[PDB]
């Protein structure tokens, strides 16, 4: 037998080392577990805000579900400069992470789901649609699916102008340099036509104080044949109150218990 | 001969596993390097905000200085619940981390310094005073040395009332539960008398947009025999603009080159 354990993992994807963390439940040698792979948000790290993904990871692990979470390229401790980041690269890494994590020794590749937060939810929704037979279920927190509309139609990124990127070479995001390549890549991105290709169980959790408009979650639901939308009164983008934190952890554990442990 | 590498490290302190990252310069097998240990801020993680400690670690590593950074107990990926967190535990851990890192194969026990950000700077100042003969130098960014005054005199923590802790059972910090034990323990904490015991080279970097009052940096200077205070015009608490991020990385590399490489 073996007690539960936290271990660090790395993988190489198109020339970048991505670094991550794995929460393995207790079990016998060689035992394989239903697994959730988690995608963090824009300019975030694999911990997520204020231990959010760590708390979710340990909750899953304490219930027999392995939890795996990597820093995307150009984020956190992975290789890559933010100035070179593109959302296309994030989607390509998300696809390659499915294959890398399904190959890990403790992962039951037949019981395998994605969890996202904010922009990570967007990536997860698109990856799920392109890899529509690979995922047992999909859970999306606070999907930041307005970012194309905001940048391309309103010419702002979280409220700050993008109109100087061409002249000045980059966008200043909290001290990080976001390059022109990111912006030139937005023309290649499609959210909802990709996302609606996934027909498995989907849960979306939206908080009424999220700065993303609620309409985007209803657009997702419009395309999902097997979706569920939970609206958390007074929940915010990052689940940054003790009551909304308890709610997001509980709602997500319930979904993955249903789709990974009881199906 | 080995190229530079990033690796993950753990240690056990008072029954908690603390988890961290080490950036090791390239060199010969078994080589021992001058080393900086970094302490993150309150409710933060070892990466720090927006890759701040990651960029600093890599800058040091590319110049022949090893960089090591752990999540404190009850923070990040380390063991422990935020509700059980106390600053006394952080101080004990910061002291114990000196020996955990100096035990590592790549670390020169005689060329070892601390770097802090915000509350981590306060922790580093106190640990430095108690273990003065262990440190070649000390660098403190944005020291949050007002927290005792703010909580004990003004009954707020970063502006939010602490007067409901007994009624609520906790203090809500961005969705984490901060417990009564933290507030009960504040009476045990002494910053400035402990800090002035360190007589090695100290550098403080303060940004004019920091929400921490500037007078706390001057108070530190009053007690240091070999201190230097750099005031970064338009710098902020987390160095979250591209100009101030460049500035903080350069000012810190200059200081550790002087104190760890050229001395
Ligand atoms: C990249 O541009 C954007 C990102 C977000 C949110 C991202 C997240 O929280 O992960 C919101 C609006 C944007 O225009
Ligand atoms: C690469 O990441 C960064 C680099 C700089 C400085 C660059 C320079 O020395 O010219 C500033 C902010 C950054 O986020
Ligand atoms: C814990 O109480 C406080 C913490 C801070 C900042 C901490 C940090 O930025 O690391 C500032 C004021 C406080 O009263
Ligand atoms: C452990 O830290 C937390 C616990 C809760 C509540 C959990 C429950 O009662 O189920 C909410 C937020 C937290 O940050
Ligand atoms: Ca020990
Ligand atoms: Ca442990």
Numbering used by the authors:
A (entry chain A), B (entry chain B): -3 to 259
How does the study describe this entry?
Here, we report the crystal structure and biochemical characterization of a feruloyl esterase (LbFAE) from Lentilactobacillus buchneri, a LAB strain that has been used as a silage additive. The LbFAE monomer structure includes 260 amino acids that forms the canonical α/β-hydrolase superfamily fold with a conserved Ser-His-Asp catalytic triad. The protein forms a homodimer with two-fold symmetry where the active sites from the two monomers are oriented facing each other. The two subunits associate to restrict access to the active site such that only single FA chains attached to arabinoxylan can be accommodated, an arrangement that excludes access to FA cross-links between arabinoxylan chains.
Wild-type crystals soaked with substrates were also screened, but only FA (i.e., the product) resulted in a complex with LbFAE. The crystal structure of LbFAE was determined in complex with FA, which allowed identification of the key residues responsible for FA binding, as well as predicting the binding mode of arabinofuranosyl ferulate (Araf-FA) binding. When viewed down the entrance, aromatic side chains are observed to line the entrance opening such that Phe207-Phe38-Phe169-Tyr169-Phe46 from each monomer together form an oval, almost closed collar. Both carboxylic oxygen atoms O1 and O2 of FA are within hydrogen-bonding distance of Ser114 Oγ. Moreover, FA O1 can hydrogen bond to the backbone amide group of Phe38, and FA O2 can form an ionic bond with His233 Nε2. Additionally, the O4 hydroxyl group of the cinnamoyl ring offers a hydrogen bond to Glu146 Oε1. Hydrophobic interactions with the cinnamoyl ring of FA involves Phe143 Cα and Cβ, and Gln154 Cγ, and the C10 atom of the methoxy substituent which engages in a CH/π interaction with the nearby Phe38 ring. In both LbFAE and LJ0536, the FA molecule is bound in the same orientation and conformation in both subunits of the homodimers, whereas in Est1E, the FA is bound in two distinctly different orientations in the active site of subunits A and B, where the binding mode observed for Est1E subunit B agrees with that in LJ0536 and LbFAE. The only difference is the precise conformation with the C2-C1-C6-C8 dihedral angle being in cis configuration (0°) in LbFAE, and trans configuration (180°) in LJ0536 and Est1E. The unliganded wild-type and S114A structures do not reveal significant conformational changes compared with the FA-bound wild-type model, which suggests that binding of substrate, and release of product, may not require major structural rearrangements. Docking of arabinofuranosyl-ferulate in the LbFAE structure highlights the restricted active site and lends further support to our hypothesis that LbFAE is specific for single FA side chains in arabinoxylan.
